[PDB]
Amino acid sequence: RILVAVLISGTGSNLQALIDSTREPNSSAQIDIVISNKAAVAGLDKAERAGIPTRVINHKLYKNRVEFDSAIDLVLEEFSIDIVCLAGFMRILSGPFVQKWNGKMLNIHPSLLPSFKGSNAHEQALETGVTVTGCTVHFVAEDVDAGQIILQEAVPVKRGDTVATLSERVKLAEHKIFPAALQLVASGTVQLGENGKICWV
Numbered sequence: 001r002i003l004v005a006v007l008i009s010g011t012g013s014n015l016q017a018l019i020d021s022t023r024e025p026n027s028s029a030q031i032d033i034v035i036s037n038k039a040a041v042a043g044l045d046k047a048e049r050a051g052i053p054t055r056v057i058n059h060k061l062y063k064n065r066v067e068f069d070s071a072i073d074l075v076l077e078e079f080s081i082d083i084v085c086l087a088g089f090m091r092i093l094s095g096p097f098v099q100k101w102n103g104k105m106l107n108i109h110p111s112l113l114p115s116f117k118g119s120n121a122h123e124q125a126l127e128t129g130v131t132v133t134g135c136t137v138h139f140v141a142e143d144v145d146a147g148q149i150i151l152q153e154a155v156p157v158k159r160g161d162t163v164a165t166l167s168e169r170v171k172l173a174e175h176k177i178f179p180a181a182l183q184l185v186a187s188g189t190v191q192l193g194e195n196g197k198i199c200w201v
């Protein structure tokens with residue numbers, strides 16, 4: 001069973017979906033710890049009501065990214081973590097950390113990368129006026145632009161949509177592909193080749 005750590009910053013709907021899929025009969029992974037850089041967020045309650053230990057590592061208490069990421073890394077090693085899932089984690093990881101976890105850290109983004117990178121993808125989409133958006137799960141890479149893509153699901157944008165409605169429709173897709181992507185990676189079906197490009201059995 002592959003040990004997983006889910007990093008969060010807020011609500012935790014994606015965390016929840018991963019908990020459910022990991023609690024499924026044939027899952028190849030189990031969530032052994034949940035880390036939040038913000039205290040008092042709902043995702044923390046979801047991990048707790050699930051019997052999953054948590055830690056709040058507040059980035060505001062550190063001097064730089066390196067220091068903050070080192071604290072996080074101490075916990076992951078402490079839990080013999082294999083795979084790291086960034087689920088709503090709103091922090092940019094330091095290069096050495098991303099380097100360390102290359103091929104073992106997945107992130108979920110609410111757009112069809114390379115479109116609408118950064119925060120507020122939904123708002124960007126609606127400002128732009130696309131009729132198709134979606135979500136993407138990928139490996140975290142040195143630069144947030146070369147992250148190897150694992151799975152994506154296109155989601156339609158309705159003409160009436162507000163950030164709330166679109167956002168909700170996109171999360172439904174996210175809960176589908178993050179669990180599947182985790183499974184894909186946890187089971188070894190998907191890996192990062194030596195050339196750094198995605199690889200399937």
Ligand SMILES: NCC(=O)N[C@@H]1O[C@H](COP(=O)([O-])[O-])[C@@H](O)[C@H]1O
Pocket residue numbers: 008009010011012013014015043087088089090108109110118119120121135171174
């Ligand atoms: N910086 C990346 C980013 O924008 N992530 C997105 O934030 C939301 C948090 O959801 P949740 O906490 O309910 O899983 C999710 O929709 C995720 O795709």
